[PDB]
Write a protein that binds this ligand. Structure first.
Ligand SMILES: [Ca+2]
Length: 433
């Protein structure tokens, strides 16, 4: 009852601090985390340190990491007031920059981009503190011979969105972000292909369903960041060519459909895009399967992540003047469910009876020199460190849930899980809720 969205927003930022890879800053707030993955590098030894660990593991999966950055930047642009009111503007910007500083390093050549550091199996076979890793961490890339329109496109979108975020605060960085964004889009558009067909290790973790939506997504963001009509023309041309108006709605690391539509609706003010957004939202509120307690049930994987993403699309739709009151209200019910209106909180470190055993390695570990290994994973006790701000997978279609570390469905946590969620919190704060 009566949730402090400002504090939840601050908590979400703490989750991102807990996901930081590389050398941590002197002002780090989640201090149980230590410098790690300091040897991450490319084929020629290029520095690839930094970025975010994806979930409860230590692999740096570029596709969802870029998506996370784009959505976080998006919320900072449209609902900056929310961050400011929560006294978290600086931290919000730092969260975006932690990702973009890494994308810049990963962009080793104009048409070359590293999309992963660490191998799924080698990484997942280990359970412990990231600073204790001793296994090889291979880096995989996409290039003109092994394209990745989806990966390069999303990264371009994130860089372009970030360039807007930093336009005034750091003009030099903003310009740099944009240069990289422009080059990555050209690479993505001129060399068509799914990144997971090149970086095959990712096909079993973050396989891309289609790269066409990312191309439109990227062009749209570049137009917003440059005001260069060429990008708008390309965005709309591809939107029509690919027939996105007929694609299944939704917004998540894999599909940008609803994001593209609500974004283009804002940039062009065209009714057609607004119609598509309305039909999608009305469908969710009135028809999409929901749990008995009101939670949108879009899929078993990252259930809350899907509901929060939907909530964010609704908040963006409200900004277009589409049923603002009802759309904002429904979005709030989804966020409020995650915060505890379903009976318990599903945000670690927050509210009533929150999850205490997230499927997360670093938070499960006691401090050094005590050993952290699979026996720690096997502990009946709650994770040693509270993972403040992490949104877990959530309850089942019947609002049932059991806090279980081995349950990588209900207790999974990930950077993409908190993206739409965090931006939605920023919006609620901005709206004065
Ligand atoms: Ca896609």
């Amino acid at each position: 009852m009566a949730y402090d969205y400002k504090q939840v927003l601050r908590d979400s930022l703490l989750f991102y601090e807990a996901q930081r890879s590389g050398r941590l800053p002197a002002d780090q707030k989640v201090t149980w985390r230590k410098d790690s993955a300091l040897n991450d590098q490319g084929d020629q030894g290029q520095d690839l340190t930094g970025g975010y660990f994806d979930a409860g593991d230590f692999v740096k999966f570029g596709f969802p990491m870029a998506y996370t950055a784009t959505v976080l930047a998006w919320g900072l642009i449209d609902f900056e007031a929310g961050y400011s009111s929560a006294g978290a503007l600086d931290d919000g910007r730092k969260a975006v920059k932690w990702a973009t500083d890494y994308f810049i390093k990963a962009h080793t050549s104009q048409n070359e981009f590293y999309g992963q550091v660490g191998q799924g199996d080698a990484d997942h076979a280990f359970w412990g503190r990231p600073e204790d890793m001793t296994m090889a961490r291979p880096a995989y890339k996409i290039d003109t011979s092994r394209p990745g329109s989806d990966l390069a496109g999303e990264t371009a979108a994130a860089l372009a969105a970030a360039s807007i975020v930093f336009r005034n605060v750091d003009g030099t960085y903003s310009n740099n972000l944009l240069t990289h964004a422009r080059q990555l889009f050209d690479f993505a558009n001129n060399y068509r292909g799914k990144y997971s067909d090149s970086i095959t290790d990712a096909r079993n973790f973050y396989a891309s369903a289609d790269y066409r939506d990312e191309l439109v997504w990227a062009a749209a963001w570049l137009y917003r960041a440059t005001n260069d009509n060429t990008y708008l023309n390309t965005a709309e041309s591809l939107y029509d060519e690919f027939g996105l108006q007929n694609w299944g709605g939704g917004l998540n690391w894999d599909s940008k459909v609803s994001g593209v539509q609500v974004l283009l609706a804002k940039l062009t003010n065209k009714q057609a895009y607004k119609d598509t957004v309305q039909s999608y939202v009305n469908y969710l509120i009135n028809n999409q399967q929901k749990t008995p307690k009101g939670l949108l049930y879009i899929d078993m994987w990252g259930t809350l992540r899907h509901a929060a993403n939907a909530a964010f699309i609704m908040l963006e739709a409200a900004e277009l003047g589409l049923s603002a009151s009802s759309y904002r209200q429904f979005a709030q019910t989804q966020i409020d469910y995650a915060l505890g209106d379903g009976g318990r909180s599903f945000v670690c470190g927050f509210g009533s009876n929150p999850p205490t055993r997230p499927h997360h390695r670093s938070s499960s570990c006691p401090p050094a020199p005590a050993t952290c290994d699979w026996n720690t994973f096997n502990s009946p006790d709650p994770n040693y460190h509270v993972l403040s701000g992490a949104l877990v997978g959530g309850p089942d279609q019947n609002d049932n849930y059991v806090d279980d570390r081995s349950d990588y469905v209900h207790n999974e946590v990930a950077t993409d899980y908190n993206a739409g969620f965090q931006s939605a919190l920023a919006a609620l704060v901005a709206l004065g809720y």
